[PDB]
Amino acid sequence: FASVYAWNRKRISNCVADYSVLYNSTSFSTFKCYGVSPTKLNDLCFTNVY
């Protein structure tokens, strides 16, 4: 990964956000969302994901 003072920004486009493939590999200790409820993420389409 990158250092915190040189954090890495990547553009994400033309994909399907399933996020159920991460259930086997990694477990997340912190997961928060602002401006949108977590349970509504499967019913939405975004514009510019960074």
């Binding site: 997340f28 997961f31 977590p38 349970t39």
Partner: peptide
Amino acid sequence: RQIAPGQTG
């Protein structure tokens, strides 16, 4: 943290 109303995982 997932044992809460409105959570996902």
